[PDB]
Amino acid sequence: AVPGDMVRIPGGTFLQGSPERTLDWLDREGQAFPRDWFTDETPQIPVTLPDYLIDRHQVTVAQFAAFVSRTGYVTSAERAGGSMVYGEQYWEIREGACWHRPAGYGSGIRGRDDHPVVHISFADAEAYARWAGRRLPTESEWERAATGPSYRLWPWGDTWDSRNANTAEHTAGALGDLDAWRTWWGAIHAVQGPMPQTTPVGAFSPRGDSVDGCADMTGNVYEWTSTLAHLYSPATRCDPTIHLVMGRSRVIRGGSWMNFRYQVRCAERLYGDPTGWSNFALGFRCARDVTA
Incomplete structure (x- = not known):
C-alpha cells in the first residue's frame, strides 16, 4: 500500500549532480556566486535506488500541529527561546520565533494551515517523521524525485518560468526590477516584521511539479534531508566554507x-x-521504504 499523500518513485540508476556545462553556463550568466560554490554538485555520479516513497507535499502547519497536539513535542526553537529570521540586512535571532510564531512574539499562523511549517530543526523533522511512521528522504532520494529520471535544471525542465514556483523571481518580476525588490524588502520589514512569504503546498501544481508528481520541490521552504554533507569525489574543490x-x-x-x-x-x-538551529524558511517532507 502506497499512502494517498505520497508518490512512488520507480527504481533505477540516475546521474546525481550537475555536469560541467551547467557550471560553465552559470559562470557565464552574470550571477553572484563563483564557480567553487557550485562544485559540490560535481562530478556527476551514478546512483542506484530502488522504488521508494516520497511525500507529494512539504509538511504543513496543520500536520505539524496535529503531531504536537498528540505528543506534546517541544521544538528546538521553543527550548532555545528563539530562531533565525532574515531581517532588514542579515540573518537574525528572533525572540519567540517558532513554528506557531513564525515572526516571533506578536505573530501567529492564522489561516496558514496549509502552508509548509518552518522553524523546524533537524531533530524536530526526524521526530515528526518517526511519529508518522516514515523518515526523512536522503539527498539522493530527494534529488531523483526532483529532476526525474534524466537530468534537468528544474523539476519541469531547462527553461525557467517564474510562474511555476514560489521564489523571489516572481516577486522581483512583479515590482519591475531587482532594485524595486530590494527597496520593497526593506519597506515590508518596517511593520509586518519578518513574516515568511510561504505559499500553500501544491498551489503551483501541476505546472511546477516533478515528473513523478512532487509539488514545491522548487522554492517555498528549504527542506531537510537525512544526508550528512559529503563530496561526490575526494578531489572535488569548493569554497572553504563548504569544506x-x-x-x-x-x-x-x-x-x-x-x-x-x-x-x-x-x-x-x-x-x-x-544540532538545533532552525529558521523561518526551512521545513521538510517525509519519505518511506515501499515496505516498512
Missing part, C-alpha cells in the same frame, strides 16, 4: 521563497547545522 561543514552539516534542498532561480535547481546543495 568546513563536510561531515558535520546535514544537506538542505529545494531553495525557498527567498531564492532566485539558480538556488532552487534540482541539484543545488545547501547545508545546515543539525
Whole structure:
C-alpha cells in the first residue's frame, strides 16, 4: 500500500549532480556566486535506488500541529527561546520565533494551515517523521524525485518560468526590477516584521511539479534531508566554507521563497547545522521504504 499523500518513485540508476556545462553556463550568466560554490554538485555520479516513497507535499502547519497536539513535542526553537529570521540586512535571532510564531512574539499562523511549517530543526523533522511512521528522504532520494529520471535544471525542465514556483523571481518580476525588490524588502520589514512569504503546498501544481508528481520541490521552504554533507569525489574543490561543514552539516534542498532561480535547481546543495538551529524558511517532507 502506497499512502494517498505520497508518490512512488520507480527504481533505477540516475546521474546525481550537475555536469560541467551547467557550471560553465552559470559562470557565464552574470550571477553572484563563483564557480567553487557550485562544485559540490560535481562530478556527476551514478546512483542506484530502488522504488521508494516520497511525500507529494512539504509538511504543513496543520500536520505539524496535529503531531504536537498528540505528543506534546517541544521544538528546538521553543527550548532555545528563539530562531533565525532574515531581517532588514542579515540573518537574525528572533525572540519567540517558532513554528506557531513564525515572526516571533506578536505573530501567529492564522489561516496558514496549509502552508509548509518552518522553524523546524533537524531533530524536530526526524521526530515528526518517526511519529508518522516514515523518515526523512536522503539527498539522493530527494534529488531523483526532483529532476526525474534524466537530468534537468528544474523539476519541469531547462527553461525557467517564474510562474511555476514560489521564489523571489516572481516577486522581483512583479515590482519591475531587482532594485524595486530590494527597496520593497526593506519597506515590508518596517511593520509586518519578518513574516515568511510561504505559499500553500501544491498551489503551483501541476505546472511546477516533478515528473513523478512532487509539488514545491522548487522554492517555498528549504527542506531537510537525512544526508550528512559529503563530496561526490575526494578531489572535488569548493569554497572553504563548504569544506568546513563536510561531515558535520546535514544537506538542505529545494531553495525557498527567498531564492532566485539558480538556488532552487534540482541539484543545488545547501547545508545546515543539525544540532538545533532552525529558521523561518526551512521545513521538510517525509519519505518511506515501499515496505516498512
